[PDB]
Structures are given as C-alpha cells and as structure tokens.
C-alpha cells in the first residue's frame, strides 16, 4: 500500500450502492443484544459513529458486555483474541 | 458407496488435497477405502478427483477384495468368512459386503481397518496422466471399470 | 365540484430590485406593511461582491391587503397574455407579482403530510386570465 | 520500431487519458469510407476477420486501411460502396527510452486491441467483389493472419 491509514483500501467496503444511499433506518441502530449472542460485523457506510477498524468487516464475534450504548464484541483476528467496541448500527444477529 | 484408490503419490500434490486423502484413511499409493455417497463425502472425493480412481464396485468384486485385503483394526488375522462371522454382525463376507454397499455399516464399525491395502495392478493400469474418458485411469469409473482395476489389484 | 375549484389570490409580492434602501418607505405606503430586506448571492462586477447585503426589498400581501393593493395596481398595468405563468401567475410593472391558485393549496405548504398539487388541480394560464379579467379589466 | 514490441496483449489496459498525457495523435485518417451518405443497403457484405488477439498500432491501421480503400479505386473516387474500420486505438503504449532504473516508459503511441474472430474491416458492395482484393492487401499490413469473410451473399 502507498499509505497506511485505517481507510486504506476501503473504497469498496465503506461505500453504499447508490440506492442504499442516505441515512439508515433507526430500528437496527437501537437493536439490543445479549451477552453470548453471535453478531456479524459490518460497517454501515451511512452511519459515521460506533465504527470499528475496517479490517474486521466480515467477522462474526461474541457479544460480551457493553460500554455506554456501544457493545464489546470478542473476535479472533487470525490467531489473536481481540475485543471490539461497536454500536448496534454496525451489527447483525447471526442466523 | 464408492471404492477409492489412490493412484498418484504425495510428492508435489497440494497439501489440502493430501490431508483429504488422509481424512479418508488413505496414506499410501494403491491404498483403497470405501466411502458412502453423501454430500459431505462427495465433495471430498471431487477434490481428490485427480489422484485417485473411484466408482461403485459389484457385490462380487467387493467380496473378492474384502476376502483378499481386509484386515482387523490390529494384527495379521485373515478376514475370512469365519472371521467375519466370529467378529462381526454378519455371518460371512458376502453379508458384510452387502452391508457396506447398502451403506448400513462401515469397516471400522465392524472392527476392521478402514483401509484395503491393494496390490499393484496385474497388467498395469491405464495411466495416471489422463482420466477414464481419455483412456487414463483417473477419476470416476464404471462399475465394470472399477471392478477391473480392483480385481487386477486383488 | 366548483367553489373549491374557483381561483383566488394568494399573495402579491411587490419588490424593488435596487442594487445596494431608502426605497422601503414608498413600498410601506404603497402596500401598508413593513418591507423586507433583499440580500444577494454571489460576488459580481456590479461592485456587488458582498454576499449578505441589502440590495432591495419586497412585500408579500395576503387577503384584503392584496386586493386593496391590486385595486390600483392592475389599473396601472395594461399587459396580459404571454406575460402569464404556466401556473396561472403574472408579474407586471418596481415589480408586482400575483400568485394565483385554487382552494386546497395549503396541502403543499403545510408541514405534516404535505404533498405537491396534482397537475389537474393546478391553475392554467387560461383559467387564470378568466378569473382576473372577470374582476375589473380586460385580458390581452 | 517493430510490431514485435507491442503486438501482444500482455499488459494491463492503459487508456485513462485523465491519468495519461502527451499521447500522440492517431494517424488513422477516416473510419467511414465510400458513400457514407448511404446506409448499408447493399446486396453483398464482406468483412476482414482477425484470427488472433493482438494489438494493432494506429500505424498499421492507417497503412492497412489506405492500402484497401486506396485500392477500392478500381471502382472510382465516388464509386458505389461503403468501407468501415470498426476499431479505434484506445490502448496507449510506452517505451523506456538510467537503464532499468525508473523504467516506466513515456507515451510513444496508440494501438487497438482486437480479439481473434472480430471483424476489423467491413465493406459493402453490389456483386462486384474487388473488395475481396482490397483486403488481401489489407491483412498484409497487420500482424495477424486473417480470414476474409462474406456475409450477405449467396450469389456465388
């Protein structure tokens, strides 16, 4: 890469298809998850806050407590355990 | 239920392909195993498709091979009718073979090694550089096709 | 059907597009209510580079305040036709614009469940000429 | 310089003029020849079909076209036929003209990428195939082997 900022190579993954453009429905930003639940991590291009490092887009971790309204999801990067601070706006229930 | 026979060695073959063969209990060339026809098993044989020979064998053939190259989970003991009857649910090899073919049991379940270590093919096989449809010996075979190979390796 | 389809005057905007005022005074008397400043957009050569800047005033009159005004404005105008809107409006003159429309217009001007007025329920140049011409004067 | 330096399609497509400057003008004079006033209302239609994907420098296009149309004057300067070269040299080409250090070349020309089987030339004629000859001379000045194909014309 020519640079090493968090958004390097994110043109795709952080852009919306023209039709999904614009403010997103609030229903999913308010969704409540319980500790132990499996949640898929995917940034909503339309939602600025509550984001996580683009490199984790696609991960499926485990909700384990929250911090403020934000949730603390545990994931495993390669072979390393990591905790991710992320809002409902960027999470989805697995299954 | 298909009869799997590794016809190409390990050198240079993809690792993820080698592990598969190993998951199917085959760890040497000419080693043969019996595999149920399931979605899960089907994917595996397809991945291993280019280094093996597989097909559904006839009752007879299976019996010939079982009698000739089956082995206990441990030891030399010959797997003959008597063995089969005094050690398995069935009364004789034929009974076992039928059960395998109809996929009602497996070589392990009956205290037998999952592997039928066959002999090199008497007369030589068709080649390991081309599939069956091309005159080779690789890929899926005819029941008559598999039988010939198996029988030649009896 | 009618009664709720027959035209009516909704606001008459009298504005003096000056280029930098003392003019409000006359607008206040000519109409009867305070004028509003007219800021301008963009920087331009007519030494009009100032974005926020008084450059004229206007006055939006409604109801009687609008009639009582047109009851002298119109007479000072002759024109008609071509000089009419595609929505049944017309400006003449110091400018004096007359916005015309039918009874259910608030549907498009309110906050909640607002909506645009359907083309059919719009006012045509023709249907406009009729209404006004039918009020102390002549068309073309 | 030789076609050998640019006739293969092994490089990435390089055509974004928004990121490339100093591209030489094309030598191709025209793409529509003959009676361009008329539309393909002809009995016969022959095409010159390239038999291998290749890159054709605007150089070769101009020489190939000229040699074909310049010949189609076996029918006259205002003859009854229409000639069309359907490909345009979009692909910008470079040359590293220091040795291999900082070698990204500088624009030196353009070329059109033709895939085997496409027709590069299409002519329209009345039963008077002098065009078939105009093309034996055309594919003579382009890299690939070519196929001279006739479409509307069961008048053999």
């Amino acid at each position: 890469p020519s640079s090493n900022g968090p958004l390097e190579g994110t043109r795709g993954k952080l852009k919306n298809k023209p039709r999904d453009r614009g403010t997103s429905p609030p229903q999913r930003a308010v969704e409540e998850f319980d500790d132990g639940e499996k949640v898929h991590l995917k940034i909503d291009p339309s939602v600025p806050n509550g984001r996580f490092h683009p490199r984790f887009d696609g991960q499926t971790g485990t909700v384990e407590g929250k911090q403020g309204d934000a949730y603390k999801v545990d994931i495993v990067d390669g072979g390393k355990e990591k905790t991710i601070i992320v809002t409902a706006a960027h999470l989805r229930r697995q299954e | 239920m298909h009869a799997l026979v590794q016809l190409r060695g390990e050198v240079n073959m993809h690792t993820d392909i080698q592990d598969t063969l190993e998951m199917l209990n085959i760890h040497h060339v000419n080693h043969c195993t019996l595999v149920p026809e399931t979605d899960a098993y089907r994917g595996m044989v397809a991945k291993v498709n280019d280094f093996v020979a597989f097909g559904e064998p006839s009752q007879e053939t299976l019996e010939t091979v079982l009698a000739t190259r089956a082995e206990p989970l441990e030891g030399d003991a010959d797997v003959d009718d008597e063995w089969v009857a005094e050690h398995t649910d069935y009364d004789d090899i034929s009974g076992l073979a039928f059960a395998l073919l109809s996929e009602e049991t497996t070589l392990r379940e009956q205290g037998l090694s999952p592997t039928l270590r066959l002999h090199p093919p008497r007369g030589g096989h068709d080649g390991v550089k081309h599939p069956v449809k091309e005159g080779g010996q690789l890929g899926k075979h005819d029941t008559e096709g598999i039988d010939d190979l198996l029988e030649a390796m009896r | 059907f009618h009664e709720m389809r027959e035209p009516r005057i909704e606001k008459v905007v009298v504005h003096m597009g000056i280029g930098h005022a003392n003019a409000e005074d006359i607008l206040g008397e000519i109409t009867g209510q305070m004028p509003v400043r007219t800021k301008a957009k963009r920087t331009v050569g007519e030494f009009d580079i100032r974005e926020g800047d008084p450059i004229g005033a206007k006055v939006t009159l409604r109801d009687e305040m609008a009639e009582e005004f047109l009851q002298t404005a119109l007479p000072l105008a002759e024109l008609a036709t071509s000089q009419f809107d595609d929505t049944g409006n017309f400006s003449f003159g110091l400018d004096v614009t007359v916005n015309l429309v039918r009874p259910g217009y608030r549907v498009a001007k309110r906050d909640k469940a607002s909506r645009s007025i359907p083309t059919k329920h719009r006012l045509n140049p023709a249907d406009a000429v009729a209404f006004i011409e039918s009020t102390y004067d002549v068309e073309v | 310089k030789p076609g050998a330096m640019y006739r293969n399609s092994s490089k990435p497509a390089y055509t974004r003029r928004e990121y490339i400057s100093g591209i030489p003008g094309k030598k191709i004079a025209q793409f529509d020849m003959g009676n361009n006033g008329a539309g393909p209302t002809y009995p016969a239609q022959v095409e010159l079909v390239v038999e291998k994907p290749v890159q054709i420098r605007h150089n070769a296009l101009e020489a190939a076209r000229v040699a074909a149309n310049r010949y189609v004057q076996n029918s006259g300067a205002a003859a009854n036929y229409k000639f069309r070269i359907r490909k345009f040299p979009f692909h910008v080409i470079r040359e590293n003209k220091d040795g291999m250090r900082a070698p990204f070349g500088k624009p030196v020309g353009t070329a059109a990428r033709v895939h085997g089987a496409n027709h590069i030339f299409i002519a329209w004629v009345n039963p008077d195939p002098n065009v078939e000859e105009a093309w034996r001379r055309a594919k003579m000045k382009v890299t690939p082997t070519i196929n001279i194909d006739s479409s509307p014309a069961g008048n053999a």
Binding site: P18, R19, R21, P26, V30 | - | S114, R115 | -
Partner: protein
C-alpha cells in the same frame, strides 16, 4: 423513479409523516414514547413501545371517546388535549407503564401548545416523563379560560348550538375530577 441509481426516500419520509432523525434520538432513551398527535377536530395520545415488526401501542386515548365520560364540548382544544393525555396516561398506568418520553412528531415545541398539554395530562396521570414546567400553559388556559373570555366578547355564541353560550372551564374540572377515581376502562 428516473433510473437504477435513483434514491427513493423511506415510505414514511415520502408521506412526510415520520421525522427519522428525531425518531432515533427519541428511541435512545429506551423508554416508551408518549405519542402526542392532533387533528382539526380531535387530539390523540398513545404510549408506544418498540417491536420486531413495528411499534406496539400499549395504551391510548382519543379526544372522541372523552364524551364516553361526560364530555359535551368541542374536542379540538386545550382542555380537550390535557384530559385526553390524562386519560391515556391512566390507561397507561393500568397497563403497567411507568415512564415515557414525549414524541410530538412533526408538531412545533411552542410553549403552552396542545402537545404539551397532552404531556402535562399524562404526567398527572402518574406517568414519569422528562419535561420542563414553564413550557406548559398556565393551568387556566388548560382549563379553557382563554375560550370562556373569548366568548365574553360575545354578541354571537362562540359555539354553534353545542352546549352553553358562555362555555364552561368548570365542565373541565368536573371531568378531570371524574377521571381521578374508579370508572370503567381506566
């Protein structure tokens, strides 16, 4: 509309009915919402909660079913609003609801407005709602005094037939009084 790339707003935005940016800030509290809505002739007050396939109304009150308790006056006024709020607030309590936040939808936060009257009503019913007292009307206006006085400048009844000629903010008290004990559907 125009093309594949065109962006059509959400149905409730097209209908110009729901303000989604406010909605989200509202849903932040995690509390039920006290939906305060109006009509030319009526005033509605609901206590909505969040659901899997959409909102759930656990308790509501409409200025119309106010007469069902002895209302013989118009229903598009201040006293009407408050009472409708108090009525819904009470049914709310019955339903086991203890707190909520005021959602005035697309209406304006004008002091002494009917929505706030709705909010004062619900609060007095026992519901705990985040509010600000000096944005509310001064009780008398809630009672409907402003209208009685307006009829004082009579010469012609403010009410076409209806009830009374000089109107009754007293009729208001009698009703609030009624709603504060026993009675069906509360």
């Amino acid at each position: 509309a125009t093309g594949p790339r065109y962006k059509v707003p959400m149905r409730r935005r097209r209908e110009a009915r729901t303000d989604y940016h406010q909605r989200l800030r509202l849903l932040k509290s995690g509390k039920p919402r006290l939906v305060a809505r109006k009509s030319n002739k009526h005033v509605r007050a609901q206590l909505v909660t969040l659901g899997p396939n959409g909102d759930d109304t656990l308790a509501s009150a409409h200025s119309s079913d106010l007469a069902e308790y002895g209302w013989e006056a118009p229903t598009g006024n201040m006293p009407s609003a408050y009472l409708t709020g108090l009525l819904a607030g009470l049914r709310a309590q019955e339903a086991g609801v203890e707190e909520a936040v005021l959602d005035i939808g697309l209406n304006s936060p004008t002091p002494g407005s009917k929505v706030f009257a709705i909010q004062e009503g619900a609060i007095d019913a026992g519901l705990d709602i985040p509010h600000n007292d000096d944005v509310l009307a001064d009780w008398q206006r809630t009672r409907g005094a402003h209208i009685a006085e307006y009829d004082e400048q009579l010469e012609e009844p403010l009410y076409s037939g209806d009830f009374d000629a000089a109107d009754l903010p007293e009729h208001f008290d009698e009703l609030r009084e009624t709603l504060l004990d026993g009675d069906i559907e509360l």
